């Protein structure tokens, strides 16, 4: 594909979902989900961070659930990232939220956070280093599967590789959604550069 | 969702793709991809297995690439699993293949195998144990996002949990696609049971 925007989550409801409708009649259901990621590796030496994401469900899906979800329920989400900007208003000029296309409450018997995107860089990479000497890069990505602008961050080896990218380059991103004003951004676990599609005729050749 | 069928791969072409058309004019392009998964964990004690999957691209996508792919090219695939059965013919009565909706050749500068499914069990679980005493279960899953029948396998803790499932139960599967007659099946890395949708009125109540 050219523009790809996919989010998969599995977290627990932190409050009872509260229904709501628009003046015209559109059902809107916001679910606050929490879970955690184990950023650790090797034989320990690291640990694991928590995440809290509000996911929005609209329409008939919102209509069939906005009444049955109890605080503490484990839920599976299949959705995408939504970018919105305005004047005035909010916290701030803009926000990125998770939009649920579907949801499926799961049995708890007695967390998953994955994101995959593909777009174009909106500006040149920004490589920086931490006091300890760890490479870190911030990337601006434009995704149109309106256009959505998303922030991505990568560390160490990946950061240094990404520092060689150029504004406008295509980028495939695979990672997890993270928090922090306050901003929802993507923490890249994997990065690849898709070579552009087939090569036209060309005036002077290439 | 109810029926979910998503496959994501990143592997290297093992031969130059060979174009082909149907009598009516449909473009068909088969790509043979290879890669490997590191089934290992903890401080070693394990290693990593290889995979070879033929992915089929049809139509205009097949038309725009079936000429530019060189043996050795790294490719990203976004697709789904396809089940086909017949009489006579093949190897054998049936086959499961990966159907590519899109593909994106990637720059190699100078592997990914993930599957997510949701369907219903077609029969009761089959729990077995290895000589070493390791729990292993084989599950039959029916997915309709025609219906596709897929085989799934899980080990240890997951296998014993899955042995408590019943024919007809809903199941969410997250794992990797594996080989081996010869059969393409799914190796579950994660399993969850989605509680069925909202509860009707009910004659005697439930």
């Amino acid at each position: 594909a050219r523009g790809l925007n996919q989010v998969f989550l599995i977290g627990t409801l932190t409050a009872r979902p509260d229904m709501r409708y628009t003046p015209g009649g559109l059902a809107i259901l916001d679910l606050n989900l929490a879970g955690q990621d184990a950023f650790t590796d090797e034989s320990g030496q690291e640990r694991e961070v928590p995440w809290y994401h509000r996911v929005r469900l609209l329409g008939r899906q919102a209509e069939m659930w906005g009444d049955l979800l109890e605080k503490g329920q484990l839920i599976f989400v299949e959705g995408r990232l939504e970018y919105r900007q305005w004047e005035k208003d909010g916290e701030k000029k803009s926000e990125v939220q998770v939009r649920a296309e579907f949801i499926d409450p799961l049995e708890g018997r007695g967390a998953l956070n994955q994101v995959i995107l593909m777009g174009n860089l909106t500006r040149d990479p920004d490589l920086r280093y931490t006091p300890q000497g760890t490479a870190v890069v911030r990337l601006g990505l434009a995704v149109n599967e309106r256009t959505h602008f998303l922030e991505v961050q990568a560390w160490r080896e990946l950061a240094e590789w990404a520092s060689e990218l150029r504004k406008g380059d295509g980028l495939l991103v695979i990672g997890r959604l993270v928090n922090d004003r306050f901003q929802t951004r993507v923490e890249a676990l994997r990065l690849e550069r898709p070579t552009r599609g087939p090569a036209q005729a060309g005036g002077s050749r290439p």
Side-chain angles (χ1 to χ4, degrees), chain A:
Chain A
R2 206 319 89 178
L4 179 58
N5 196 327
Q6 287 261 157
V7 177
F8 288 115
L9 301 173
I10 291 179
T12 73
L13 277 176
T14 50
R16 202 168 184 287
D18 183 48
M19 197 55 147
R20 188 150 161 170
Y21 298 84
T22 66
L26 188 64
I28 304 175
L29 189 70
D30 275 29
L31 307 191
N32 305 289
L33 294 182
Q36 43 248 112
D37 295 310
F39 113 82
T40 181
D41 277 295
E42 58 160 297
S43 50
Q45 185 55 10
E46 299 169 305
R47 21 41 215 244
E48 69 170 55
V49 295
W51 57 255
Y52 305 86
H53 293 302
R54 190 209 74 207
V55 317
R56 174 166 296 194
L57 192 53
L58 301 180
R60 192 57 202 173
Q61 192 91 205
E63 190 101 58
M64 60 162 96
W65 296 110
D67 49 72
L68 318 187
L69 308 174
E70 306 276 55
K71 175 175 188 172
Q73 299 210 195
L74 193 64
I75 310 287
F76 167 62
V77 179
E78 180 198 323
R80 57 190 152 68
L81 296 183
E82 262 197 46
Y83 177 74
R84 262 221 98 237
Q85 192 188 302
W86 58 91
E87 292 237 12
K88 275 325 99 221
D89 226 279
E91 201 25 305
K92 260 237 87 58
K93 294 282 166 292
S94 161
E95 66 135 46
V96 178
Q97 63 176 293
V98 180
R99 175 71 187 300
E101 298 155 352
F102 312 97
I103 65 169
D104 290 284
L106 308 169
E107 173 63 314
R109 181 183 183 180
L112 180 68
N113 182 349
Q114 182 212 321
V115 178
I116 177 166
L117 299 171
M118 183 154 49
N120 293 278
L121 294 195
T122 49
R123 59 169 191 283
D124 290 311
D126 164 60
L127 180 69
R128 301 293 125 190
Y129 288 84
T130 56
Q132 306 296 294
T134 305
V136 75
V137 70
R138 271 299 179 78
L139 305 162
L141 200 74
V143 177
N144 198 300
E145 321 107 68
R146 183 180 60 177
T147 293
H148 298 287
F149 302 81
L150 310 164
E151 219 55 33
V152 188
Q153 177 180 289
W155 301 76
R156 317 176 173 71
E157 57 228 9
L158 271 189
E160 297 201 312
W161 172 91
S163 63
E164 198 180 304
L165 286 166
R166 307 168 184 170
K167 172 183 170 184
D169 285 338
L171 183 60
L172 173 64
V173 184
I174 301 186
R176 42 192 185 76
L177 207 69
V178 303
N179 303 303
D180 287 301
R181 282 158 184 173
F182 153 63
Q183 54 149 29
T184 306
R185 76 171 199 293
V186 180
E187 196 89 328
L189 299 163
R190 186 148 179 186
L191 295 182
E192 302 294 342
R193 227 246 297 168
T195 50
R196 322 307 169 214
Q200 202 235 37
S204 63
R205 220 258 71 156

mmCIF file of all heavy atoms in Angstrom, chain A residues 1-4 116-123 125 137-143 150-154 158 161-163 165-166 168-174 188 190-196:
data_model
loop_
_atom_site.group_PDB
_atom_site.id
_atom_site.type_symbol
_atom_site.label_atom_id
_atom_site.label_comp_id
_atom_site.label_asym_id
_atom_site.label_seq_id
_atom_site.Cartn_x
_atom_site.Cartn_y
_atom_site.Cartn_z
ATOM 1 N N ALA A 1 0.875 -1.195 0.000
ATOM 2 C CA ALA A 1 0.000 0.000 0.000
ATOM 3 C C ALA A 1 0.894 1.221 0.000
ATOM 4 O O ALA A 1 2.113 1.093 0.056
ATOM 5 C CB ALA A 1 -0.884 -0.003 1.240
ATOM 6 N N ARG A 2 0.288 2.404 -0.078
ATOM 7 C CA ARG A 2 1.036 3.665 -0.043
ATOM 8 C C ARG A 2 0.839 4.182 1.386
ATOM 9 O O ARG A 2 1.787 4.269 2.172
ATOM 10 C CB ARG A 2 0.451 4.673 -1.041
ATOM 11 C CG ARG A 2 1.434 5.729 -1.572
ATOM 12 C CD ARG A 2 2.382 6.284 -0.501
ATOM 13 N NE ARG A 2 3.604 5.486 -0.380
ATOM 14 C CZ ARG A 2 4.606 5.767 0.451
ATOM 15 N NH1 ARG A 2 4.528 6.829 1.244
ATOM 16 N NH2 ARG A 2 5.693 5.000 0.477
ATOM 17 N N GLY A 3 -0.409 4.518 1.707
ATOM 18 C CA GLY A 3 -0.746 4.976 3.039
ATOM 19 C C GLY A 3 -1.318 3.805 3.825
ATOM 20 O O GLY A 3 -2.297 3.182 3.415
ATOM 21 N N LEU A 4 -0.695 3.491 4.952
ATOM 22 C CA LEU A 4 -1.154 2.403 5.798
ATOM 23 C C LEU A 4 -1.285 2.975 7.194
ATOM 24 O O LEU A 4 -0.413 3.708 7.656
ATOM 25 C CB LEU A 4 -0.143 1.255 5.773
ATOM 26 C CG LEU A 4 -0.405 0.010 6.622
ATOM 27 C CD1 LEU A 4 -1.727 -0.630 6.240
ATOM 28 C CD2 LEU A 4 0.733 -0.972 6.421
ATOM 29 N N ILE A 116 1.305 0.089 13.041
ATOM 30 C CA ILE A 116 2.016 -0.057 11.763
ATOM 31 C C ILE A 116 1.576 1.076 10.818
ATOM 32 O O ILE A 116 0.401 1.201 10.476
ATOM 33 C CB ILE A 116 1.784 -1.458 11.114
ATOM 34 C CG1 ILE A 116 2.498 -1.507 9.765
ATOM 35 C CG2 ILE A 116 0.309 -1.762 10.980
ATOM 36 C CD1 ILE A 116 2.636 -2.893 9.181
ATOM 37 N N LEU A 117 2.526 1.922 10.432
ATOM 38 C CA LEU A 117 2.250 3.065 9.564
ATOM 39 C C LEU A 117 3.209 3.151 8.394
ATOM 40 O O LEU A 117 4.310 2.616 8.437
ATOM 41 C CB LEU A 117 2.400 4.377 10.332
ATOM 42 C CG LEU A 117 1.555 4.748 11.547
ATOM 43 C CD1 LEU A 117 2.168 6.000 12.148
ATOM 44 C CD2 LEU A 117 0.098 4.981 11.178
ATOM 45 N N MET A 118 2.780 3.856 7.355
ATOM 46 C CA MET A 118 3.601 4.093 6.173
ATOM 47 C C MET A 118 3.167 5.433 5.593
ATOM 48 O O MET A 118 1.997 5.663 5.307
ATOM 49 C CB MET A 118 3.454 2.966 5.142
ATOM 50 C CG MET A 118 4.344 3.145 3.918
ATOM 51 S SD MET A 118 4.753 1.586 3.102
ATOM 52 C CE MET A 118 3.129 0.827 2.971
ATOM 53 N N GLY A 119 4.125 6.334 5.473
ATOM 54 C CA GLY A 119 3.834 7.643 4.953
ATOM 55 C C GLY A 119 5.112 8.266 4.461
ATOM 56 O O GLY A 119 6.054 7.558 4.095
ATOM 57 N N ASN A 120 5.152 9.594 4.470
ATOM 58 C CA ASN A 120 6.317 10.330 4.007
ATOM 59 C C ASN A 120 6.784 11.273 5.088
ATOM 60 O O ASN A 120 5.969 11.791 5.847
ATOM 61 C CB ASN A 120 5.957 11.144 2.763
ATOM 62 C CG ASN A 120 5.648 10.273 1.575
ATOM 63 O OD1 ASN A 120 6.553 9.814 0.879
ATOM 64 N ND2 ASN A 120 4.366 10.021 1.343
ATOM 65 N N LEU A 121 8.096 11.489 5.157
ATOM 66 C CA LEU A 121 8.654 12.411 6.132
ATOM 67 C C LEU A 121 8.206 13.818 5.729
ATOM 68 O O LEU A 121 8.193 14.158 4.545
ATOM 69 C CB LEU A 121 10.186 12.353 6.142
ATOM 70 C CG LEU A 121 10.886 11.087 6.614
ATOM 71 C CD1 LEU A 121 12.331 11.427 6.873
ATOM 72 C CD2 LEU A 121 10.255 10.570 7.883
ATOM 73 N N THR A 122 7.829 14.629 6.708
ATOM 74 C CA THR A 122 7.389 15.986 6.427
ATOM 75 C C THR A 122 8.552 16.968 6.586
ATOM 76 O O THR A 122 8.459 18.131 6.178
ATOM 77 C CB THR A 122 6.228 16.401 7.359
ATOM 78 O OG1 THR A 122 6.568 16.084 8.712
ATOM 79 C CG2 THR A 122 4.928 15.687 6.967
ATOM 80 N N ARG A 123 9.645 16.489 7.175
ATOM 81 C CA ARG A 123 10.840 17.306 7.381
ATOM 82 C C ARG A 123 12.035 16.379 7.564
ATOM 83 O O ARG A 123 11.861 15.166 7.691
ATOM 84 C CB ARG A 123 10.673 18.190 8.618
ATOM 85 C CG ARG A 123 10.418 17.427 9.900
ATOM 86 C CD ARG A 123 10.537 18.338 11.105
ATOM 87 N NE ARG A 123 10.560 17.581 12.352
ATOM 88 C CZ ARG A 123 9.486 17.048 12.924
ATOM 89 N NH1 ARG A 123 8.293 17.193 12.367
ATOM 90 N NH2 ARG A 123 9.607 16.368 14.055
ATOM 91 N N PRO A 125 15.199 14.445 9.334
ATOM 92 C CA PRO A 125 15.359 13.879 10.678
ATOM 93 C C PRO A 125 16.095 14.819 11.646
ATOM 94 O O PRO A 125 16.865 15.696 11.234
ATOM 95 C CB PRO A 125 16.126 12.583 10.413
ATOM 96 C CG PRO A 125 15.598 12.169 9.076
ATOM 97 C CD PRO A 125 15.616 13.475 8.304
ATOM 98 N N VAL A 137 16.179 9.942 17.713
ATOM 99 C CA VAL A 137 15.693 10.743 16.600
ATOM 100 C C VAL A 137 14.174 10.964 16.667
ATOM 101 O O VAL A 137 13.422 10.096 17.118
ATOM 102 C CB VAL A 137 16.072 10.058 15.239
ATOM 103 C CG1 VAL A 137 15.262 8.775 15.042
ATOM 104 C CG2 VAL A 137 15.866 11.019 14.076
ATOM 105 N N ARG A 138 13.746 12.153 16.245
ATOM 106 C CA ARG A 138 12.329 12.523 16.184
ATOM 107 C C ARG A 138 12.009 12.727 14.708
ATOM 108 O O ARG A 138 12.720 13.443 14.005
ATOM 109 C CB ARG A 138 12.056 13.818 16.958
ATOM 110 C CG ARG A 138 11.730 13.627 18.434
ATOM 111 C CD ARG A 138 10.465 12.789 18.619
ATOM 112 N NE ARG A 138 10.129 12.565 20.028
ATOM 113 C CZ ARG A 138 9.553 13.463 20.823
ATOM 114 N NH1 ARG A 138 9.235 14.666 20.355
ATOM 115 N NH2 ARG A 138 9.295 13.159 22.090
ATOM 116 N N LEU A 139 10.944 12.089 14.243
ATOM 117 C CA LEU A 139 10.555 12.170 12.840
ATOM 118 C C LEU A 139 9.119 12.635 12.682
ATOM 119 O O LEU A 139 8.263 12.275 13.483
ATOM 120 C CB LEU A 139 10.689 10.790 12.185
ATOM 121 C CG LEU A 139 12.034 10.070 12.276
ATOM 122 C CD1 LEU A 139 11.840 8.601 11.978
ATOM 123 C CD2 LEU A 139 13.020 10.707 11.308
ATOM 124 N N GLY A 140 8.867 13.433 11.647
ATOM 125 C CA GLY A 140 7.520 13.900 11.364
ATOM 126 C C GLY A 140 7.029 13.120 10.155
ATOM 127 O O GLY A 140 7.679 13.131 9.114
ATOM 128 N N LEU A 141 5.890 12.443 10.282
ATOM 129 C CA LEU A 141 5.359 11.629 9.188
ATOM 130 C C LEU A 141 3.945 12.038 8.750
ATOM 131 O O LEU A 141 3.080 12.306 9.585
ATOM 132 C CB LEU A 141 5.360 10.155 9.612
ATOM 133 C CG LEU A 141 5.297 9.060 8.542
ATOM 134 C CD1 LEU A 141 6.641 8.978 7.851
ATOM 135 C CD2 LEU A 141 4.953 7.715 9.173
ATOM 136 N N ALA A 142 3.724 12.079 7.433
ATOM 137 C CA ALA A 142 2.426 12.436 6.851
ATOM 138 C C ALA A 142 1.810 11.175 6.264
ATOM 139 O O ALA A 142 2.408 10.543 5.398
ATOM 140 C CB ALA A 142 2.610 13.485 5.766
ATOM 141 N N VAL A 143 0.617 10.812 6.740
ATOM 142 C CA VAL A 143 -0.065 9.591 6.284
ATOM 143 C C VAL A 143 -1.458 9.815 5.704
ATOM 144 O O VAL A 143 -2.350 10.307 6.392
ATOM 145 C CB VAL A 143 -0.231 8.542 7.436
ATOM 146 C CG1 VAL A 143 -0.996 7.334 6.927
ATOM 147 C CG2 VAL A 143 1.137 8.117 7.991
ATOM 148 N N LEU A 150 1.809 12.518 12.016
ATOM 149 C CA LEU A 150 2.159 11.801 13.227
ATOM 150 C C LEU A 150 3.634 11.955 13.602
ATOM 151 O O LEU A 150 4.491 12.137 12.739
ATOM 152 C CB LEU A 150 1.794 10.328 13.034
ATOM 153 C CG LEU A 150 0.363 10.154 12.519
ATOM 154 C CD1 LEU A 150 0.195 8.769 11.988
ATOM 155 C CD2 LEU A 150 -0.650 10.443 13.619
ATOM 156 N N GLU A 151 3.914 11.891 14.898
ATOM 157 C CA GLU A 151 5.271 12.012 15.403
ATOM 158 C C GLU A 151 5.788 10.607 15.715
ATOM 159 O O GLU A 151 5.059 9.776 16.260
ATOM 160 C CB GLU A 151 5.265 12.863 16.669
ATOM 161 C CG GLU A 151 6.437 13.803 16.807
ATOM 162 C CD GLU A 151 6.593 14.709 15.602
ATOM 163 O OE1 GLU A 151 5.570 15.075 14.984
ATOM 164 O OE2 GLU A 151 7.745 15.068 15.285
ATOM 165 N N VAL A 152 7.043 10.344 15.353
ATOM 166 C CA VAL A 152 7.666 9.048 15.594
ATOM 167 C C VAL A 152 9.039 9.255 16.228
ATOM 168 O O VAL A 152 9.724 10.234 15.946
ATOM 169 C CB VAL A 152 7.840 8.254 14.282
ATOM 170 C CG1 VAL A 152 8.310 6.846 14.591
ATOM 171 C CG2 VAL A 152 6.533 8.218 13.514
ATOM 172 N N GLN A 153 9.429 8.338 17.104
ATOM 173 C CA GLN A 153 10.726 8.422 17.759
ATOM 174 C C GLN A 153 11.410 7.065 17.778
ATOM 175 O O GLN A 153 10.772 6.049 18.011
ATOM 176 C CB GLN A 153 10.569 8.929 19.188
ATOM 177 C CG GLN A 153 11.883 8.961 19.949
ATOM 178 C CD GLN A 153 11.722 9.465 21.365
ATOM 179 O OE1 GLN A 153 11.475 10.652 21.592
ATOM 180 N NE2 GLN A 153 11.852 8.560 22.331
ATOM 181 N N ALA A 154 12.715 7.059 17.529
ATOM 182 C CA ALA A 154 13.491 5.825 17.517
ATOM 183 C C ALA A 154 14.813 6.033 18.264
ATOM 184 O O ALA A 154 15.338 7.143 18.327
ATOM 185 C CB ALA A 154 13.753 5.387 16.084
ATOM 186 N N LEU A 158 18.589 2.267 15.424
ATOM 187 C CA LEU A 158 17.526 2.756 14.533
ATOM 188 C C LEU A 158 17.585 4.256 14.321
ATOM 189 O O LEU A 158 17.382 4.736 13.206
ATOM 190 C CB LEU A 158 16.131 2.400 15.062
ATOM 191 C CG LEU A 158 15.510 1.065 14.665
ATOM 192 C CD1 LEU A 158 14.063 1.029 15.119
ATOM 193 C CD2 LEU A 158 15.587 0.895 13.157
ATOM 194 N N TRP A 161 20.349 5.226 11.933
ATOM 195 C CA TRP A 161 20.008 4.823 10.565
ATOM 196 C C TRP A 161 19.019 5.848 10.013
ATOM 197 O O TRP A 161 19.170 6.308 8.881
ATOM 198 C CB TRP A 161 19.356 3.431 10.553
ATOM 199 C CG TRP A 161 18.774 2.990 9.207
ATOM 200 C CD1 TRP A 161 19.411 2.280 8.220
ATOM 201 C CD2 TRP A 161 17.439 3.235 8.720
ATOM 202 N NE1 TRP A 161 18.557 2.064 7.158
ATOM 203 C CE2 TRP A 161 17.344 2.637 7.437
ATOM 204 C CE3 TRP A 161 16.314 3.898 9.247
ATOM 205 C CZ2 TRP A 161 16.169 2.688 6.669
ATOM 206 C CZ3 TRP A 161 15.147 3.949 8.482
ATOM 207 C CH2 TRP A 161 15.084 3.344 7.207
ATOM 208 N N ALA A 162 18.017 6.206 10.821
ATOM 209 C CA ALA A 162 16.984 7.169 10.422
ATOM 210 C C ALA A 162 17.517 8.577 10.194
ATOM 211 O O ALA A 162 16.894 9.370 9.491
ATOM 212 C CB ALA A 162 15.868 7.211 11.468
ATOM 213 N N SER A 163 18.663 8.892 10.787
ATOM 214 C CA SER A 163 19.249 10.217 10.625
ATOM 215 C C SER A 163 19.720 10.442 9.183
ATOM 216 O O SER A 163 19.980 11.581 8.782
ATOM 217 C CB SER A 163 20.424 10.404 11.593
ATOM 218 O OG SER A 163 21.474 9.487 11.322
ATOM 219 N N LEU A 165 17.866 9.678 6.543
ATOM 220 C CA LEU A 165 16.673 9.873 5.724
ATOM 221 C C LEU A 165 16.532 11.346 5.338
ATOM 222 O O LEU A 165 17.142 12.220 5.961
ATOM 223 C CB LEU A 165 15.426 9.451 6.500
ATOM 224 C CG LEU A 165 15.134 7.978 6.719
ATOM 225 C CD1 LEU A 165 14.060 7.863 7.790
ATOM 226 C CD2 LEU A 165 14.699 7.331 5.410
ATOM 227 N N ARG A 166 15.711 11.613 4.323
ATOM 228 C CA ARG A 166 15.473 12.975 3.846
ATOM 229 C C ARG A 166 13.989 13.322 3.876
ATOM 230 O O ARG A 166 13.129 12.438 3.839
ATOM 231 C CB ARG A 166 15.945 13.134 2.401
ATOM 232 C CG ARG A 166 17.367 12.731 2.114
ATOM 233 C CD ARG A 166 17.529 12.681 0.614
ATOM 234 N NE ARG A 166 18.840 12.212 0.205
ATOM 235 C CZ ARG A 166 19.153 11.905 -1.046
ATOM 236 N NH1 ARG A 166 18.241 12.015 -2.002
ATOM 237 N NH2 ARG A 166 20.375 11.494 -1.340
ATOM 238 N N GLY A 168 10.473 14.014 2.741
ATOM 239 C CA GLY A 168 9.807 13.464 1.572
ATOM 240 C C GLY A 168 9.985 11.973 1.347
ATOM 241 O O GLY A 168 9.229 11.372 0.582
ATOM 242 N N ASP A 169 10.977 11.373 2.001
ATOM 243 C CA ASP A 169 11.224 9.942 1.857
ATOM 244 C C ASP A 169 10.060 9.126 2.372
ATOM 245 O O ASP A 169 9.348 9.561 3.278
ATOM 246 C CB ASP A 169 12.474 9.516 2.623
ATOM 247 C CG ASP A 169 13.747 9.933 1.940
ATOM 248 O OD1 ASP A 169 13.718 10.174 0.719
ATOM 249 O OD2 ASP A 169 14.781 10.004 2.630
ATOM 250 N N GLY A 170 9.872 7.941 1.797
ATOM 251 C CA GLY A 170 8.804 7.066 2.240
ATOM 252 C C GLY A 170 9.327 6.304 3.441
ATOM 253 O O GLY A 170 10.518 5.989 3.504
ATOM 254 N N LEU A 171 8.460 6.005 4.400
ATOM 255 C CA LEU A 171 8.911 5.290 5.579
ATOM 256 C C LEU A 171 7.870 4.306 6.091
ATOM 257 O O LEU A 171 6.690 4.640 6.166
ATOM 258 C CB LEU A 171 9.269 6.297 6.684
ATOM 259 C CG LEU A 171 9.849 5.777 8.010
ATOM 260 C CD1 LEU A 171 11.155 5.039 7.739
ATOM 261 C CD2 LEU A 171 10.086 6.942 8.973
ATOM 262 N N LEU A 172 8.313 3.091 6.419
ATOM 263 C CA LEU A 172 7.436 2.070 6.986
ATOM 264 C C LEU A 172 7.785 2.020 8.465
ATOM 265 O O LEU A 172 8.949 1.834 8.822
ATOM 266 C CB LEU A 172 7.683 0.689 6.359
ATOM 267 C CG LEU A 172 6.930 -0.503 6.982
ATOM 268 C CD1 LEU A 172 5.424 -0.337 6.803
ATOM 269 C CD2 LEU A 172 7.406 -1.792 6.329
ATOM 270 N N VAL A 173 6.779 2.196 9.317
ATOM 271 C CA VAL A 173 6.978 2.189 10.764
ATOM 272 C C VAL A 173 6.203 1.088 11.491
ATOM 273 O O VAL A 173 5.021 0.858 11.238
ATOM 274 C CB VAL A 173 6.562 3.558 11.392
ATOM 275 C CG1 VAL A 173 6.865 3.560 12.893
ATOM 276 C CG2 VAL A 173 7.278 4.712 10.692
ATOM 277 N N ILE A 174 6.890 0.396 12.390
ATOM 278 C CA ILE A 174 6.261 -0.633 13.201
ATOM 279 C C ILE A 174 6.713 -0.416 14.650
ATOM 280 O O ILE A 174 7.902 -0.491 14.966
ATOM 281 C CB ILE A 174 6.631 -2.045 12.724
ATOM 282 C CG1 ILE A 174 6.202 -2.222 11.269
ATOM 283 C CG2 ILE A 174 5.926 -3.084 13.588
ATOM 284 C CD1 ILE A 174 6.393 -3.627 10.748
ATOM 285 N N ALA A 188 8.918 3.735 17.609
ATOM 286 C CA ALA A 188 9.310 2.773 16.586
ATOM 287 C C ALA A 188 10.173 1.643 17.105
ATOM 288 O O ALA A 188 11.188 1.876 17.763
ATOM 289 C CB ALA A 188 10.034 3.486 15.455
ATOM 290 N N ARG A 190 10.632 -0.854 14.784
ATOM 291 C CA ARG A 190 11.208 -1.249 13.506
ATOM 292 C C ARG A 190 10.973 -0.185 12.425
ATOM 293 O O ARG A 190 9.922 0.455 12.403
ATOM 294 C CB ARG A 190 10.623 -2.590 13.084
ATOM 295 C CG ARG A 190 11.261 -3.118 11.860
ATOM 296 C CD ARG A 190 11.285 -4.615 11.873
ATOM 297 N NE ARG A 190 11.884 -5.124 10.645
ATOM 298 C CZ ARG A 190 11.941 -6.414 10.333
ATOM 299 N NH1 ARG A 190 11.428 -7.323 11.167
ATOM 300 N NH2 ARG A 190 12.512 -6.792 9.193
ATOM 301 N N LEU A 191 11.966 0.022 11.558
ATOM 302 C CA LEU A 191 11.871 1.006 10.473
ATOM 303 C C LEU A 191 12.466 0.491 9.156
ATOM 304 O O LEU A 191 13.508 -0.170 9.147
ATOM 305 C CB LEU A 191 12.561 2.326 10.864
ATOM 306 C CG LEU A 191 12.027 3.192 12.016
ATOM 307 C CD1 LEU A 191 12.883 4.442 12.132
ATOM 308 C CD2 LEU A 191 10.590 3.573 11.772
ATOM 309 N N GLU A 192 11.794 0.795 8.046
ATOM 310 C CA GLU A 192 12.251 0.372 6.720
ATOM 311 C C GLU A 192 11.893 1.451 5.708
ATOM 312 O O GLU A 192 10.914 2.167 5.878
ATOM 313 C CB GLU A 192 11.573 -0.929 6.294
ATOM 314 C CG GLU A 192 11.778 -2.124 7.234
ATOM 315 C CD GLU A 192 13.218 -2.619 7.294
ATOM 316 O OE1 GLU A 192 14.010 -2.299 6.383
ATOM 317 O OE2 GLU A 192 13.549 -3.343 8.253
ATOM 318 N N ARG A 193 12.696 1.570 4.662
ATOM 319 C CA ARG A 193 12.443 2.554 3.635
ATOM 320 C C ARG A 193 11.941 1.864 2.369
ATOM 321 O O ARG A 193 12.653 1.059 1.749
ATOM 322 C CB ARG A 193 13.711 3.359 3.336
ATOM 323 C CG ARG A 193 13.450 4.853 3.297
ATOM 324 C CD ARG A 193 13.664 5.412 1.912
ATOM 325 N NE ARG A 193 15.051 5.236 1.504
ATOM 326 C CZ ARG A 193 15.493 5.412 0.265
ATOM 327 N NH1 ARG A 193 14.653 5.774 -0.696
ATOM 328 N NH2 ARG A 193 16.772 5.205 -0.017
ATOM 329 N N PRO A 194 10.679 2.133 1.987
ATOM 330 C CA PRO A 194 10.204 1.476 0.771
ATOM 331 C C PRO A 194 10.682 2.239 -0.447
ATOM 332 O O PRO A 194 10.494 3.448 -0.527
ATOM 333 C CB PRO A 194 8.687 1.514 0.936
ATOM 334 C CG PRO A 194 8.471 2.814 1.621
ATOM 335 C CD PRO A 194 9.565 2.809 2.680
ATOM 336 N N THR A 195 11.331 1.536 -1.371
ATOM 337 C CA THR A 195 11.797 2.170 -2.584
ATOM 338 C C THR A 195 10.521 2.567 -3.316
ATOM 339 O O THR A 195 9.557 1.797 -3.342
ATOM 340 C CB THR A 195 12.622 1.203 -3.430
ATOM 341 O OG1 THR A 195 11.915 -0.028 -3.610
ATOM 342 C CG2 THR A 195 13.911 0.903 -2.739
ATOM 343 N N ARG A 196 10.503 3.761 -3.901
ATOM 344 C CA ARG A 196 9.304 4.232 -4.584
ATOM 345 C C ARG A 196 8.813 3.330 -5.704
ATOM 346 O O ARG A 196 9.487 2.391 -6.132
ATOM 347 C CB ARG A 196 9.519 5.620 -5.178
ATOM 348 C CG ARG A 196 10.358 6.553 -4.325
ATOM 349 C CD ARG A 196 9.836 6.655 -2.893
ATOM 350 N NE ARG A 196 10.792 7.337 -2.026
ATOM 351 C CZ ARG A 196 10.966 7.047 -0.740
ATOM 352 N NH1 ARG A 196 10.244 6.088 -0.178
ATOM 353 N NH2 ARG A 196 11.874 7.692 -0.025
#
